[PDB]
Structures are given as structure tokens and as C-alpha cells.
Amino acid sequence: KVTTVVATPGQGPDRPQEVSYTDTKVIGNGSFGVVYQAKLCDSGELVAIKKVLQDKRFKNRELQIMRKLDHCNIVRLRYFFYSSGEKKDEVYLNLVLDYVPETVYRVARHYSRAKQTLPVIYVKLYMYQLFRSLAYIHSFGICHRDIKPQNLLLDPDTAVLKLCDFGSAKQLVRGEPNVSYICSRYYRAPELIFGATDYTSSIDVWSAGCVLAELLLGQPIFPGDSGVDQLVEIIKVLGTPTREQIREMNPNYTEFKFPQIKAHPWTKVFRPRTPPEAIALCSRLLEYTPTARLTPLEACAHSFFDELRDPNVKLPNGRDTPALFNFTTQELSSNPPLATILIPPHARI
């Protein structure tokens, strides 16, 4: 049947509207709640509806976060409404997000099964947009804490990427502790493994470097089997951290003695044909020292993305490249002057 609810626009005036949807169906389940997919009856558009059980007393981290966000590389919150909870002090929040069935994961797994590697052009396009979204959400102090191929939505025709699933996201406040066992194993930063609770949103950059590395290699770079095996996988490439590095990751972790293993060459981590600049970029993302990782903006401005800033550039299918330089003040806040490097003089309006 055709469901109709009174919802509030995600980005926009707090005044409700009716909203009817149909062809609803569960596509995901878990601890977080339930996710459905449906079609809008007046927009035709397909959307995803995440239904979470919320405690009335408190606000909903995810809802609050999605409301500040209005960026082109971030899944848009169309509407949101509530549902009758069962236990008097509980409600079901219904985030009506945008639906895209394609993910950088599916795509990547596609090429992987076809034994070949993803085209460099796409690796630059995807990673680029990923960083902008990171730069944007970080500018608010928001950390996604769950960056991975599966949470990266794609438009197969436009080549546009959107960050999604802010279920683990959180507005970070220095001095206030954050859970250390957060983020999907394969993408979890070293400091999280070492028990850090005073970490920063730079754990998202470590994760991005992992996604990048994964696109270059054809499979995740650090496929640890547990928390301890994760560090072992990391050590296999970066070797063991120096005391200075350990202090940086976790000021409160102490190990009086441990065997020191050196790092392997990045040039050998990847296949021989891997573009050098992708490796270079990757080495500045997968660092033990959190503060040493490139910031999203610095990364967007990296030499690896130079080709995206070229006027002639086009997609392998003659199509145009999505909006890559429509940076806002918010988005540039961390280092406004970099704006002159990110924005090609051939894009200035």
C-alpha cells in the first residue's frame, strides 16, 4: 500500500509536510535499527529510510549531524519523521535519506573479480570527492568514524560520490573521551587499536588512505582477523611505531620494551604499474602519527589530483566531471588560502 506520514524537511524550514511512499522493503538489519528502501509518490525518486529506536529524553546524534550537513558529496537527508515507540520513553526516528544502489565497494569488487584494476581516473575522482566530504564534515568537528568502500555511494552515469551512514559519526570535543573500539576493523587507525580515547577526526584520513590503498591493490590493504592481527597487518607495512609515534597515538600507553621492525617500501606494497603519485599520497595518509596525516583539504590539493584541475579533463565516457571546485567558506575554513590552489583559475566565475 501507499504509506503517508507527516515529516520535516532535512535541510530547510522546520515546518512539516505530508509524505507518501511505497514499494517499501527491508534491505538492511542490525543493532543500529532497520533500513528500508522505497519510492516517493510525487517525486518518483527512490530513498532509503533508516529507522532507529531513540530515547526521548536525549537528542539523536545522527539526526543532529545530518541536519547541519548540506554538501554535494554527502548523502542528503530528505525528510525525517517519528513513529510510535513501544516503551513510553522511546520513539523511532525515521531518517529518509537518498538511495543509490551503487557503492565504491561494489564497483571495486567488480574490477577485482574481473582481475583488472580500477581506472586511475576514477581513483582520483572518488578519492577526491571523499576528501571534500571529509573536509566538509570535519569543519564542523564531526568525525564519521566509519569510512570504508561500502559507505561511499556512486552515480554510475555522473560519477558523483556521496558519503553515507553516519551511524558512527560524532561531533568530537577535545577533552571529552570517545570509545576506542570504533570503525570497521580493516579501516581502524593504529591509535584506536592502542586504546586511544582522545583521538581526532584524523582517524577518518587513516581510513581514507586505506580505501585508496584498496583501490590500487584490488583488495583491502590491512585485512586483520582481530584487533591484534590488525596491528600486525599494519606492522607488516609500516613496521613498528617509534616511541615518539606511540606517545602521539596514545599519550597514556606504556610498553617498556619491544622488538623494532622496520617498514617495507611503499613502492613494493603496490603492483609495479601503480602511479607513483597515488603511492606518494597514500604514504602521507597511512602514518602512525595522527597529527602527521594530511588533512582532507591538503589531500584534495595533492599533486595526485592535478589532473582533475585540468580544463580539458573528461570522463572515459566523454561526460563532464562533477562539481569539483564549488568550495564553500565552511569547507575551506581550516585553511582558507588553499582556496587559490584548489580552485583552478579556469573555474573562477
Binding site: 587499536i193 591484534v228 606492522i235 607488516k236 606511540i246 600507553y253 610498553e255
Partner: peptide, 25 residues
Amino acid sequence: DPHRLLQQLVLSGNLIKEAVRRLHS
């Protein structure tokens, strides 16, 4: 149970040392 195992390696201060051991087996 690895969470606990990790929690102990971290509490005890034998995370790096232990990971290296496993690295050699």
C-alpha cells in the same frame, strides 16, 4: 576472546611486543 586479549595487551603494555611475536610465527 580477542577484545579482552587486546584489552589486556593494552593494559599490560605488551601490544607491540605481542604483535611482533605473531608476526614471526
